[PDB]
Amino acid sequence: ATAYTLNLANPSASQYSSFLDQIRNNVRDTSLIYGGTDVEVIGAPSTTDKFLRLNFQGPRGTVSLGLRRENLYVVAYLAMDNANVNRAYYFKNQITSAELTALFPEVVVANQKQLEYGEDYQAIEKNAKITTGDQSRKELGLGINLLITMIDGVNKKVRVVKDEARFLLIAIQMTAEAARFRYIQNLVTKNFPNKFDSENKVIQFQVSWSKISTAIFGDCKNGVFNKDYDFGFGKVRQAKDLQMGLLKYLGRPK
Known part of the structure; x- marks a missing residue:
């Protein structure tokens, strides 16, 4: 529509x-x-x-x-x-x-x-x-x-x-x-409007959308993960470092 x-x-x-x-x-x-x-x-x-x-x-x-x-x-x-x-x-x-x-x-x-x-x-x-x-x-x-x-x-x-x-x-x-x-968006605007090489990090983000969403939804407090996470490109403790643009719907926060 x-x-x-x-x-x-x-x-x-x-x-x-x-x-x-x-x-x-x-x-x-x-x-x-x-x-x-x-x-x-x-x-x-x-x-x-x-x-x-x-x-x-x-x-x-x-x-x-x-x-x-x-x-x-x-x-x-x-x-x-x-x-x-x-x-x-x-x-x-x-x-x-x-x-x-x-x-x-x-x-x-x-x-x-x-x-x-x-x-x-x-x-x-x-x-x-x-x-x-x-x-x-x-x-x-x-x-x-x-x-x-x-x-x-x-x-x-x-x-x-x-x-x-x-x-x-x-x-x-x-x-x-x-x-x-947003990492992907930023790469596009940074190289605008040219064609450029993708990266392992780009693919790593894509395959872990659900995992990232689940981690922020149920194992994160005020932007800080309760434990270190690694989605392929290194340890992350703060959600901000993931530069997320949109999270998967997993229900309302408990």
């Missing part, structure tokens, strides 16, 4: 940051305070407003992303094919035809296609056909200019799973992940 647009025609660091804040502010429950921190926390699941639409506006067209408001998981994407026909591709276990019709009204039922692979990084990465290093998303790098290049691969083009998968990897990280982790 609700939609936010990122103007990639005339991108600026401030616009990107405000865009992420709009996502955070949309899904958060301001009454939720985890571990005595000021970090935004996603609110309880809604049965009336389940999805959020993100529009990547470019000079040659617009590609859209659909995310679940309850956890920021990707559910689908919209892009015009080589015949300028709007088409929506979705993950079966994430959304239905009726909901997809409401999310992307410009796409007719016949043009709704269920993706052949899973929504997890592993499944998408295998279809991305990355041939160097560990062959994971880390090998693609990050950045505004990279996102623009990836969009060109799906915008008004014949669907190629390799290009589609690569677009999803970058789009998910530049939106959902950047919303959750």
Whole structure:
């Protein structure tokens, strides 16, 4: 229903940051305070407003992303094919035809296609056909200019799973992940708008969202963890050092 647009025609660091804040502010429950921190926390699941639409506006067209408001998981994407026909591709276990019709009204039922692979990084990465290093998303790098290049691969083009998968990897990280982790946001704005190398720390943050959220929710007092934690990149005792942007909903603080 609700939609936010990122103007990639005339991108600026401030616009990107405000865009992420709009996502955070949309899904958060301001009454939720985890571990005595000021970090935004996603609110309880809604049965009336389940999805959020993100529009990547470019000079040659617009590609859209659909995310679940309850956890920021990707559910689908919209892009015009080589015949300028709007088409929506979705993950079966994430959304239905009726909901997809409401999310992307410009796409007719016949043009709704269920993706052949899973929504997890592993499944998408295998279809991305990355041939160097560990062959994971880390090998693609990050950045505004990279996102623009990836969009060109799906915008008004014949669907190629390799290009589609690569677009999803970058789009998910530049939106959902950047919303959750300020460290990721800061890397993007620091190198704005250039493409740059990703890091082990970037991946380490992503795989430990739940662990980090659980730690702040139930083992943290006034921003200080009750015991040292290590999520892969070193010992942390203060939640502030994690530079979190959005915590997973785990219920209300006890």
